[PDB]
Write an enzyme that holds these catalytic residues in place. Structure first.
Site, PDB file in Angstrom:
ATOM      1  CG  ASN C  29      -1.914  -1.083   1.279  1.00 56.56           C
ATOM      2  OD1 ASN C  29      -2.873  -1.098   0.508  1.00 56.56           O
ATOM      3  ND2 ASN C  29      -1.705  -2.034   2.180  1.00 56.56           N
ATOM      4  CG  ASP C  83     -12.965   4.113   9.052  1.00 60.93           C
ATOM      5  OD1 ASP C  83     -12.627   5.262   9.412  1.00 60.93           O
ATOM      6  OD2 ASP C  83     -14.093   3.623   9.284  1.00 60.93           O
ATOM      7  CG  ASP C 155     -19.471 -18.358  -0.639  1.00 64.00           C
ATOM      8  OD1 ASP C 155     -19.363 -19.121  -1.621  1.00 64.00           O
ATOM      9  OD2 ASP C 155     -20.511 -18.268   0.040  1.00 64.00           O
TER      10      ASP C 155
END
Lengths: 262, 262, 262, 262
Positions: C29, C83, C155
């Site tokens: 990231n 977050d 799932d």
């Protein structure tokens, strides 16, 4: 409205345009003409710009740098480009021109952009061919390469050259991208005894450079002023611009020293 | 992250920036300094860009065009700017330099941006004044105006000149702004016997022009090559760049004919 | 200075920023925090923006849409996000939170961006884990997916859900990109009896949407006003916003009709 | 090719455009229409953007919020704008519409941009006036102000209202410009018993707000669902969107408490 061009990975240019006049994509090229309050008309030819306002600058510079340094001009060759203005300036000499451009579609789409389009396309001495194999074979006096050519393109073109031959090609700007220019010169030096970089004085608008290559023709020493002063309807080219085109700052001269085949 | 530069109302330049290093602000000026991965640090002074890694180009060109065209440099005047690198180059000569700039806050803000900041300011022969009135009355061998002066400022500085002195000032680039340059020349032609425009060769990143004006000193005819070759530590300026700076396109030589004085 | 974000292939946003406060790239990231005169601070987390000024909006909306529709809140799961504000709002309930984020480096770099960073990281009921395998296994009451999850992610998360379970995930804006939202809903419908899209009323700043999925919990009918009015220090969320969040124009209702598992 | 939209002094939107279709200009307004590959044609009116393919959203919302909240529509007034699509929607009711706009040239310039251009202008019950003074004296059931009115304009239109009439006007978006909205409400609260702010749900591409003001008609309590369901050919407006438009974040409900009137 506006458009943008990347002149560097860290530098772009934004142009305010008043309209889009033409769009023709090809199975190989894409051309778009815009109306500019600054340049009259801007042509975006595959990530490169052309300013209708200043087509005389580069056209007059290349054509006459070749013309006024060559004793005899009878056969000329222009590959990898769409610039017919170069051709208009070269015809100010008593010479034949072989234009090789496979993309007719794009080429013809310049019908209004190039001021002397028809005057050039209908010249009895101007022969336009899709490719090289479509031309009578012969050796030329001056060859022009409108896109920075590679080692192969260079060799292929060097044999089509007369003993007296001169080759003017395109490269990046020597200061902004000295590493590119350095490479362009090394390539040229491999086969030419004369390899010298130059720029278009005052044409502060493009990240562009040029190389004057030859086997025995010096761009500064073989300049013939009488051929210069004899030229007519020229608005940019003259002897001052010609010589100034080869000026290099102190550092740069050191940087290109041994790649410069003066 | 990006910043912009307005070269024209229809043309912009966009520089990718990595960080903002400074944000100073006075009653009359605002200065921001950014870090670029290529041009080193970039300073944005009242939307005028300065490049740290290339400050030497303009400073050496302006200083030495004067120094190599004059017999002796004893008194020099700099006005309307913050260019300490110009004075630094001028200190290669054993001359005194009067530097007028009312904005101390912004000037000192260049403490890190100018590589020779302290050396210039600590020179016994460097005088920083807030205004022309705080200076001693005297004549100068060479005067530098770092902003385009109007005909009134010209008239004023004009009289602080020695009979054989030289007045060098900034103006607009003659390619994109010929009308402006024209007017800048007629205003000079008004009180000076010599008035010639020139640019900074290979400097494609700037829309700036300059004028070399005087009462009789000639930028080319009075050029002293010995003085040029003595400058072994400069990185840009040389004879080829000096002469090349005055080269004008054929059409500009003609439109400027009346105002240009040799 | 400014920065830019592509919200669409044909639409970008330009944000004027006064400075760059932080930059930390990871082997997965990249995060960059900017100082904004409009939003206070803008965090660019891998081509997505976060406005310090409005962290309460989305955090309060998701947290309480879940909280006020669930009779019992004891175990919560948050995957694919950074977050922590969501977490601060969810703690306004008597519940445990399992935060799964492998990128500690990036996560910790929010130290100052998220107003309640420390208050959340040091909560006795807040357990942060690098991955799923690092948590005691169990079934949760509410699962949050901060990035539009795929059929597999869906799932895998649906089995970790309690019979009473609720799943709130992210998707595109239902109007601007109805085709994306349509796909996000189809996927959700494959395993959930309740799949309903919603947006953040008045949060006119992002091309973002959300889906409220479940097996037997309706987001509008199971809303408990008393849990709502009991919440403290909330600046955005209330019953009006909650219900309004599910409003859809006439056409859109038709477009999502059978993908909407109301 | 791109154009820009200034939503804020620090925030811009950039739309890729394929062509410029029109460039009209009057003494008071300038209008440009562009072709976008996604939003259909985009009209730029005094730097305010209008989207052809989405004109129905605002027109249906404004017209029908009025029509479904009033018993009968007989006389309607539209001022300060060029929105013919609003009148088109209002013509679903058998009402007369007075349309005031001094700039005929720009208005007619919308001949192709507005899909229902001719139908609206040819309506026996549509009156286009250059100014309010050329109109017959009378009261209106509903008045529309297409620009934020100052307290003086409000005072003026206010008196051209029937006792049970409704005044709908534009204002700034309350999320990004709450201070502005606040003032817009206090100015209305001054002469009206009802004054409530609302936005256009799912319309994330616009920084625009509106106010529903009146002497006693209530935007929610006087809502007639039968009238809403009769509108089978509208593509956006419905009851869920009507009520949802008035929803306010908890903190805005509080800051606006004093000026809001129900």
């Amino acid at each position: 409205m506006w458009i943008t061009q990347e002149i560097t990975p860290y530098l772009r240019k934004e142009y305010t345009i008043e309209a889009k006049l033409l769009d023709v994509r090809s199975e190989h090229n894409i051309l778009e003409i815009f109306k500019s309050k600054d340049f009259g008309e801007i042509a975006m030819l595959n990530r490169q710009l052309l300013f209708k306002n200043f087509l005389h600058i580069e056209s007059e510079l290349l054509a006459h740098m070749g013309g006024c340094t060559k004793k005899e001009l009878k056969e000329v060759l222009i590959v990898d480009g769409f610039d017919l203005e170069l051709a208009h300036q070269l015809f100010k000499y008593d010479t034949h021109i072989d234009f090789v451009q496979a993309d007719e579609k794009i080429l013809d789409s310049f019908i209004s952009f190039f001021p002397h389009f028809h005057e050039v396309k209908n010249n009895k001495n101007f022969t336009h061919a899709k490719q090289l194999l479509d031309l009578d074979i012969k050796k030329y006096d001056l060859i022009f390469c409108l896109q920075e050519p590679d080692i192969h393109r260079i060799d292929g073109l060097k044999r089509m050259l007369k003993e007296d031959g001169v080759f003017i090609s395109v490269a990046k700007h020597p200061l902004l991208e000295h590493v590119s220019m350095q490479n362009a010169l090394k390539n040229m030096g491999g086969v030419f005894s004369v390899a010298m970089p130059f720029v278009a004085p005052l044409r502060i608008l493009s990240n562009k450079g040029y190389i004057y290559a030859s086997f025995k023709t010096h761009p500064l020493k073989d300049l013939m002023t009488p051929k210069i002063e004899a030229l007519t309807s020229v608005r940019y080219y003259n002897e001052d611009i010609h010589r100034a085109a080869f000026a290099l700052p102190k550092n740069l001269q050191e940087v290109f020293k041994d790649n410069i085949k003066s």
